[PDB]
Amino acid sequence: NSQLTLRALERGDLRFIHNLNNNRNIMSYWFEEPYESFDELEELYNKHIHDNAERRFVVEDAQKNLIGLVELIEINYIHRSAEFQIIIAPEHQGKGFARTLINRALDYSFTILNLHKIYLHVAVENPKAVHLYEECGFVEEGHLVEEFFINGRYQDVKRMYILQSKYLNR
Amino acid sequence: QLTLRALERGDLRFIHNLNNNRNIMSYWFEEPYESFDELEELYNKHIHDNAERRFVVEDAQKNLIGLVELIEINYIHRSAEFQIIIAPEHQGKGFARTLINRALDYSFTILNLHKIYLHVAVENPKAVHLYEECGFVEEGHLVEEFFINGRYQDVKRMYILQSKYLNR
Amino acid sequence: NSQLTLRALERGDLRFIHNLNNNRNIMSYWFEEPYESFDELEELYNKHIHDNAERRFVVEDAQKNLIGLVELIEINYIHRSAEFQIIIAPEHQGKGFARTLINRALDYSFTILNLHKIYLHVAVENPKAVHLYEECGFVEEGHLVEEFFINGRYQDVKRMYILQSKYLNR
Amino acid sequence: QLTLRALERGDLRFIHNLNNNRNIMSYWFEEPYESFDELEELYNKHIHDNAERRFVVEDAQKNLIGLVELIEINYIHRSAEFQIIIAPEHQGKGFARTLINRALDYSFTILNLHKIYLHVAVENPKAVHLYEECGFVEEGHLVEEFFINGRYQDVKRMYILQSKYLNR
Amino acid sequence: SNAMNSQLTLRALERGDLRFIHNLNNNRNIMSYWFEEPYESFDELEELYNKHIHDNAERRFVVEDAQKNLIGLVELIEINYIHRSAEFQIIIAPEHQGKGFARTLINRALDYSFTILNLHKIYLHVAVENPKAVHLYEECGFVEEGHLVEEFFINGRYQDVKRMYILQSKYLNRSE
Amino acid sequence: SNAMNSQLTLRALERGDLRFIHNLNNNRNIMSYWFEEPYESFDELEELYNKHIHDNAERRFVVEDAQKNLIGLVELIEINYIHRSAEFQIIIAPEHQGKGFARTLINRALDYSFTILNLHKIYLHVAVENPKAVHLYEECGFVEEGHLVEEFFINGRYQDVKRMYILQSKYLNRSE
Amino acid sequence: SNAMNSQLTLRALERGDLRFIHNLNNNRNIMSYWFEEPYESFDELEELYNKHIHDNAERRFVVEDAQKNLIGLVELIEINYIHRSAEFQIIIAPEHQGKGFARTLINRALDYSFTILNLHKIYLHVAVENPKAVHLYEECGFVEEGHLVEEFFINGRYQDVKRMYILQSKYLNRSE
Amino acid sequence: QLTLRALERGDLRFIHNLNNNRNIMSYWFEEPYESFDELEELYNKHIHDNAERRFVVEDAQKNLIGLVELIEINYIHRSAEFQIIIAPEHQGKGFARTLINRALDYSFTILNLHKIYLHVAVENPKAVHLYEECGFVEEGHLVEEFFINGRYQDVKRMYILQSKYLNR
Amino acid sequence: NSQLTLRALERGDLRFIHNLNNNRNIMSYWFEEPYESFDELEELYNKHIHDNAERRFVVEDAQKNLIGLVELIEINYIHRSAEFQIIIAPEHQGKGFARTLINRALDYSFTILNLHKIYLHVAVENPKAVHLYEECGFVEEGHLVEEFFINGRYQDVKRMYILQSKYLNR
Amino acid sequence: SNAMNSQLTLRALERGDLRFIHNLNNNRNIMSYWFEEPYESFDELEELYNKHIHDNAERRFVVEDAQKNLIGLVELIEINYIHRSAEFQIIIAPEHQGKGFARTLINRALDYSFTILNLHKIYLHVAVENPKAVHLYEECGFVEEGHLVEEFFINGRYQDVKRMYILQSKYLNRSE
Amino acid sequence: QLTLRALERGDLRFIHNLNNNRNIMSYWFEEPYESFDELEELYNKHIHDNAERRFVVEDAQKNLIGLVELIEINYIHRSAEFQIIIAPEHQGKGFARTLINRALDYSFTILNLHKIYLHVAVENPKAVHLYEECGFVEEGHLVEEFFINGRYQDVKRMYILQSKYLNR
DSSP G139-172: HTT-EEEEEEEEEEEETTEEEEEEEEEEEHHHHH
Contact A40 D48 (CB under 8 A): yes
Looking at the DSSP assignment, which residues form a beta bridge with residue F153? F158
Q: Report the DSSP pairing between strands I139-150 and I117-123.
A: unpaired
Q: How far is residue D66's CA from residue D11's CA, in Å, rounded to a whole number?
A: 11
Helices then strands, each counted (H, E), chain I:
6, 7
Q: Which residues of J81-92 are buried (b: 16+ CB within 10 A; e: fewer)?
A: eebbbbbbbbbb
CB–CB of K79/I116 below 8 Å? Answer: no
Which residues of chain J make contact with K20, given a CB cutoff of 8 A? 9-11
Picking from B35, B41, B149, the nearest residue to G12 by CB comes out as B35
Whether E63 and E73 have beta carbons less than 8 Å apart is answered as yes
Q: Hey, are the CB atoms on D111 and B78 less than 8 Å from each other? A: no
CB atoms A55 and J43 under 8 Å: no
List the single residue in H with minimal CA-CA distance to K74. H75
For residues F129 and F159, the answer to whether their CB atoms sit within 8 Å is yes
* D115-121 and J59-64 strand pairing: unpaired
Distance from CA of H140 to the nearest CA of I (A): 4
Q: Is residue J127 helix, strand or coil?
A: strand
The answer for residues whose C-beta is within 8 angstroms of residue H126's C-beta and 6 or more apart is none
How do the residues of chain K divide into helix, strand and coil, expressed in percent and rounded to 5? 35, 35, 30
Q: Which residues of G142-156 are buried (b: 16+ CB within 10 A; e: fewer)?
A: beebbebbbbbbbee
- Is F141 in a helix, a strand, or coil? coil
For chain I, list the contacting chains (3+ Cβ pairs, <8 Å).
E, F, H, K
User: Tell me, what DSSP letter sits at residue B146?
Assistant: E
Within E23-120, strands assigned E span 59-64, 70-80, 85-92
Angle subtended at Cα B36 by Cα B35 and Cα B40, rounded to the nearest 5 degrees? 120
| Residue C31: other Cβ atoms inside 10 A | 18
Strands J70-80 and J59-64: antiparallel
CA-based angle J144:J150:J151, to the nearest 5?
65
Q: Are H86 and H103 in contact (CB under 8 A)?
A: no
Helix (H), strand (E) at residue A159: strand A153-163
Strand, coil or helix: D13: helix
D141, closest residue in chain C (CA to CA): C141
Contact between residue B106 and residue B70 where contact means Cβ atoms under 8 Å apart: yes
The long-range contacts involving F136-143, CB below 8 angstroms and separated by at least 24 positions, are F136/F102, F136/F103, F136/F106, F137/F106, F137/F164, F138/F164, F139/F103, F140/F103, F140/F106, F140/F107, F140/F110, F140/F166, F141/F166, F141/F170, F141/F171, F142/F166
**Among candidates H41, E118, E51, H145, which has minimal Cα distance to I77?**
E118
Three-state secondary structure call for residue E41 = coil
As a whole number of angstroms, the distance between CA J120 and CA J84 comes to: 5
Torsions phi, psi for J85 (to 5 deg):
-130, 160
Nearest chain E residue to H149 by CA: give it: E115
Could you give the CA distance from residue H86 to residue H95 in angstroms, rounded to a whole number?
Answer: 8
8-state DSSP, C92: G
Output phi, psi for D132, to 5 deg: -60, -40
Catalytic (active-site) positions of E:
137
Give me the domains of chain D, ranges plus CATH numbers: 1-168 (3.40.630.30)
> Among positive and negative, which fits the CA dihedral C106, C109, C111, C116?
negative
CB contact under 8 A, B111 and D76: yes
* Helix residue ranges per DSSP H, E62-163: 102-111, 131-139
Chains I and K touch (3+ CB pairs under 8 A): yes
Residues 6+ apart with CB under 8 A from I15: I38
* Mutation site, B3, B41, B47, interface C, largest C CB count within 10 A: B47
User: Alpha carbon of C155 to those of C20, C123, C134, C151, F56: distances in Å?
Assistant: 22, 7, 20, 9, 37
Long-range contacts of G74-81 (CB under 8 A, 24+ apart): G74/G10, G74/G105, G74/G106, G74/G108, G74/G109, G76/G109, G76/G113, G76/G117, G76/G122, G79/G117, G79/G119, G81/A77, G81/G56
Q: Which of J18, J106, J11 is nearest to J68 (CA)?
A: J11
On whether the CB atoms of residues G30 and G20 are closer than 8 A, the answer is: no
Q: Which residues of G touch B31 (CB under 8 A)?
A: 116-117
Angstrom distance (rounded) from CA A32 to CA C128: 45
Single-letter amino acid, residue H121:
A
Indicate the length of chain I as a whole number: 170
What's the reported resolution, in angstroms, to a tenth?
Answer: 1.4
Return left, alpha or beta for B167; rule: phi > 0 is left, psi -120 to 50 is alpha, else beta. left
Cα I52 to Cα E81: distance, rounded to the nearest angstrom: 10
CB spacing of I145 vs H152 below 8 angstroms: no
Q: Decide if G172 contacts G125 (C-beta within 8 A).
A: no
Q: Which residues of K3-36 are buried (b: 16+ CB within 10 A; e: fewer)?
A: ebebbeeebeebbbebbbbbebbbbbbeebbbbb
Cβ-based contacts of D109 with chain A (< 8 Å)? 151-152
* Nearest Cα to Cα of residue H80 among H106, H99, H102, H46: H106
Task: Report the C-alpha gap between F123 and E147 in whole angstroms.
Answer: 13
Which residue(s) pair with G61 in the sheet? Answer: G12, G74
Who contacts G23 (Cβ-Cβ below 8 Å, separation ≥6)?
Answer: G94
**DSSP strand E in B11-93: where?**
53-58, 64-74, 79-86
Q: Is J174 annotated as a binding residue?
A: no
Q: What angle do CA E167, E170, E174 make, to 5 degrees?
A: 160
Nearest CA-CA partner of H4 in H85, H59, H50, H71: H59
G98: left (phi over 0), alpha (psi -120 to 50) or beta: left
Contact E11 H22 (CB under 8 A): no
Asked if residues I9 and I69 have their Cβ atoms less than 8 Å apart, the reply is: yes
Per the entry, the structure determination technique was: X-ray
Q: Please list, in sequence order, all residues whose beta carbon lies within 8 angstroms of the beta carbon of residue B35, skipping any fewer than 6 positions away.
A: G12, G13, G14, G53, G60
On chain G, the residues whose CB falls within 8 A of the CB of A52 are: 56
Nearest to A33 by CA among A150, A132, A169: A150
Q: Nearest CA of chain C to the CA of E151: how many Å?
A: 13
Rg of chain B (C-alpha set): 16
Chain J environment of K38 (Cβ under 8 Å): 12, 53-54
Three-class secondary structure assignment of A76-128: CCCCCEEEEEEEECHHHCCCCCHHHHHHHHHHHHHHHCCCCEEEEEEECCCHH
Q: Report CA-CA distances (Å) from C46 to C17, C39, C72, C76, E43.
A: 14, 10, 18, 21, 8
* Pick from B156, B157, B49, B165: nearest CA to B114: B165
The helix (run of H) or strand (run of E) holding residue A165 is helix A164-168
CA distances from K84 to H35, H167, K25 (A): 52, 40, 11
Closest CA to E76 of E141, E149, E12: E12
Q: Which residues of I fall in the annotated binding site for spermine?
A: 27, 32, 40, 48-51, 83-85
Residues 6 or more apart whose Cβ sits within 8 Å of residue H134: H97, H100, H101, H104, H160
Instruction: State the Cα–Cα distance between residues H137 and H122, nearest whole angstrom.
Output: 13
User: Is the Cβ–Cβ distance between I28 and I150 less than 8 Å?
Assistant: yes
- Which residues are CB-contacts of B22 (< 8 A; sequence separation ≥ 6)? B32, B33, B149, G116
Q: In angstroms, rounded to a whole number, what is the distance separating the alpha carbons of residues C12 and C15?
A: 7
Cβ neighbours, 10 Å, residue A52 = 10
- G153·J84 Cβ contact <8 A: yes
A94-104: string of b/e by CB count within 10 Å (b at 16+)?
A: eeebbebbbeb
Sign of CA dihedral J56, J61, J66, J70: negative
Nearest to K111 by CA among K83, K67, K137, K81: K81
Burial class (CB in 10 A: 0-12, 13-18, 19+), I50: exposed
Tell me if J153 and G84 make a contact (CB, 8 A cut-off).
yes
Q: Which residue out of J33, J137, J158, J171 is catalytically annotated?
A: J137
Whether B47 contacts C39, CB under 8 Å: yes
| Residues C33, B110: C-beta atoms closer than 8 Å | yes
3-state SS track over I13-77? HHHHHHHHHCCHHHHHCCCCCCCCCHHHHHHHHHHCCCCCCCEEEEEECCCCCEEEEEEEECCCC
* Cα D80 versus chain centre, distance: 11
Q: How far apart are CA H112 and CA H166, in angstroms?
A: 11
Give the whole-angstrom CA distance, residue H64 versus residue I127.
Answer: 49
Return d(Cα D2, Cα D11) in angstroms, integer.
16
Chain A interface residues (partner G, CB cutoff 8 A) = 52, 77-80, 112-114
User: Using CA atoms, how far apart are residues G24 and G94, in angstroms rounded to an integer?
Assistant: 8
Instruction: Identify whether the C-beta of residue E151 lies closer than 8 Å to the C-beta of residue E115.
Output: no
Question: Do the Cβ atoms of K29 and K146 come closer than 8 Å?
Answer: yes
| Size (chain E), residues | 176
Bridging pattern class, strands D115-121 and D79-86: parallel
CA–CA gap between residue G12 and residue B26 (Å, rounded)? 17
- Check: CB of residue D15 under 8 Å from CB of residue D67: yes
By residue count, chain F amounts to 176
Nearest neighbour of I114 by CB, restricted to E56, E84, E117: E84
How many CA atoms does the CB half-sphere of E63 hold within 13 Å?
Answer: 24
Residue A28: its H or E element:
helix A24-28
CA distances from residue K165 to G9, G135, K99, K161 in whole angstroms, order as listed: 75, 71, 14, 6
I100 and I4 Cβ atoms separated by less than 8 Å: yes
J137 is catalytic: yes
Across the interface, of K6, K112, K166, the residue whose CB is closest to I36 is K6
Q: Which of K155, K149, K123 lies closest to K32, judged by CA?
A: K149
Q: How far apart, in whole angstroms, are the C-alpha atoms of residue D122 and residue D154?
A: 6
- Return the half-sphere exposure (C-beta side, CA atoms, 13 A cut-off) of residue A41: 22
Angle, vertex CA K34, rays to CA K29 and CA K38, nearest 5: 120
C-alpha separations of I45 from I3, I14, I38, I41, I56 in Å:
27, 9, 10, 6, 10
Burial of K101-117, coded b for 16+ CB within 10 Å and e otherwise, reads ebbbebbbbbbbbebbb
- How many whole angstroms separate alpha carbon B80 and alpha carbon B114? 9
Report helix angle A38-47 to A14-21, nearest 10: 120
H–A contact (≥3 CB pairs within 8 Å)?
no
Query: Phi, psi (5° rounding) for residue A134?
Result: -60, -40
The DSSP line for E22-33 is HHHHT-HHHHHT
Q: F5: burial class by Cβ within 10 Å (0-12, 13-18, 19+)? A: middle
Question: Which residues is D67 bridged to in the sheet?
Answer: D56, D85
CA distance A112 to H26: 78
Between CA E164 and CA E131 the distance in angstroms is 13
The DSSP letter of residue E166 is E
Q: In D, which residues are within 8 Å of B112 by CB distance?
A: 76-78
